[PDB]
From TrEMBL:
Organism: Streptococcus pneumoniae (strain ATCC BAA-255 / R6)
Protein name, as recorded: DNA topoisomerase 4 subunit B
Residues of the full protein shown: 17 to 226 of 647
GO cellular component: chromosome
Described function: Topoisomerase IV is essential for chromosome segregation. It relaxes supercoiled DNA. Performs the decatenation events required during the replication of a circular DNA molecule.
One GO term (biological process): DNA topological change
GO MF annotation, one: DNA binding
Keyword match Cytoplasm: no
């Protein structure tokens, strides 16, 4: 198993997300959402909020355990390793984004790391604030690289359908979509 940098993804994006059109663009969304969904499947967090931001970026927030806030080797944050080392999901999105921010909440603290220009870290994982001890979760916001995708316009209906389906499969978890470009909004939740 050979590890690679994010440059490898950028030179061969089709190999990881299939294409660089609308389908490939939305694959980025699926990757980030599936992480939140996987966490909820394990029973952590009961709502997953997706927001299409006005600047074109997209936000996914869950209330699971939060990504690891600890250190890897050489003082490098565990989360930075996940977002910058290709084990060939998260790193792929980061590599194909002009910028990405990840915010982690756990143990009364709120941490944040920011990446730019294809996943280059411009900060470390720094504590930016505090929260209630019970509050946990992960928030990821990314701006897809316009120099890679033929379209960077997220389609509300496409994402809405995918979240609806994810909600039906999860059960007892609320999935929401909010379009800040049009003020459109919707929520999905299926009981059992
Ligand atoms: C939106 C999004 C994006 C990413 C990369 C991870 C996650 C995420 C990851 C997790 N859970 C974890 O990372 C687990 C990993 O095992 C220790 C406890 O935390 N919940 N949510 C959510």
């Amino acid at each position: 198993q050979v590890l690679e940098g994010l440059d490898a993804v950028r030179k061969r994006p089709g190999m990881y997300i299939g294409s660089t059109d609308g389908a490939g663009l939305h694959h980025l969304v699926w990757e980030i959402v599936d992480n939140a969904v996987d966490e909820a499947l394990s029973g952590f967090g009961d709502r997953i909020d997706v927001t299409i931001n006005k600047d074109g970026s997209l936000t996914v927030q869950d209330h699971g355990r939060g990504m690891p806030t600890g250190m890897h080797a050489m003082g490098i944050p565990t989360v930075e390793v996940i977002f910058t080392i290709l084990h060939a999901g998260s790193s792929v999105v980061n590599a194909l984004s002009s910028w990405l921010e990840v915010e982690i909440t756990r143990d009364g603290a709120v941490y944040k790391q920011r990446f730019e220009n294809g996943g280059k870290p411009v900060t470390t994982l720094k504590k930016i604030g505090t929260a209630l001890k019970s509050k946990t979760g992960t928030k990821v916001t990314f701006m897809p690289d316009a120099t890679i995708f033929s379209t960077t316009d997220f389609k509300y209906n496409t994402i809405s359908e995918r979240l609806n389906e994810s909600a039906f499969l999860l059960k007892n978890v609320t999935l929401s979509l909010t379009d800040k470009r049009t003020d459109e909004a919707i929520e999905f939740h299926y009981e059992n």
